[PDB]
Amino acid sequence: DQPMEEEEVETFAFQAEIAQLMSLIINTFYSNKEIFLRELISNSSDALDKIRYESLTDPSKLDSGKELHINLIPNKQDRTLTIVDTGIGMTKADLINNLGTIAKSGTKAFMEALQAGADISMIGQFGVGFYSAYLVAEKVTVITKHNDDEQYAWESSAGGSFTVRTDTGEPMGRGTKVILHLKEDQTEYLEERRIKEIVKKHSQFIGYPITLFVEKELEHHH
């Protein structure tokens, strides 16, 4: 009897300082947790800047999709908030290198800044704004697709490790999805009014379309 599907999953340890940062963030009380969304939208914008730049000299970079935009997708039934972009995306090595195993100077520097009295909202200036996701999320899943490459899924609940595997669910043309599985007391970020006010307040200068898709699984059809 054959399995419908089978795939290899790799588990990697976070570099020490990244593990420390994630513990501080996911565990500590902060009054301004809404900044996570700003940080994630900012990273999407950067990724969109990148594919756009590459396409300037090689238009075929956009064969996997010309539209450059950001989508925000609250799903109250799954208790997830997903941010999707059609940016450059990442290779498997990119995921492993850039989301856990190699620490930049900004990781330690940021924690030093916080100890010296800085605010968590500054996190983006240290290049680690992604991890601010764990202010509101207990688990984060990153689905990503780069040109000429397969679709991969990265995931961590911040236990000091993350997994990587091939994603065969729903094929993306190109880009990245960051799926936040929200903490039970952070479900306000699934509400339309909350998402809208946070984007209005913090992402006014993002130069790409940002579009809300309110997701609901229709009855008897989950």
Ligand X SMILES: COc1cc(-c2nc(C)nc3[nH]cc(C#N)c23)c(Cl)cc1Cl
Binding residues for ATP: 43, 85, 104, 130
* C-beta closer to ligand X: residue 212 or 217: 212
Instruction: Mark residues 120-159: x for contact with ligand X by CB under 6 A, - for none.
Output: -------xx-x-----------x-----------------
**How many helical (H) and strand (E) elements, i.e. helices and strands, does the chain have?**
5, 8
80-109 residues in contact with ligand X (CB under 6 A) are 85, 87-90, 98-99
Considering only the stretches 4-12, 25-33, 37-45, 58-66, report the one whose residues sit in contact with ligand X under the rule CB under 6 A: 37-45
Distance in angstroms (rounded) separating the CA atoms of residues 213 and 56: 30
Nearest approach, Cβ of residue 165 and ligand X (Å): 16
Distance in angstroms (rounded) separating the CA atoms of residues 180 and 88: 20
* C-beta closer to ligand X: residue 130 or 152: 130
Distance in angstroms (rounded) separating the CA atoms of residues 51 and 125: 22
- Token look-up 């969304």 returns 37
Whether 180 and 133 have beta carbons less than 8 Å apart is answered as yes
40 binds ligand X (CB under 6 A): yes
Q: Return the H-helix or E-strand segment holding 23.
A: helix 16-27
User: Residues interacting with ligand X, by CB under 6 A?
Assistant: 40, 43-44, 47, 85, 87-90, 98-99, 127-128, 130, 142, 176, 178
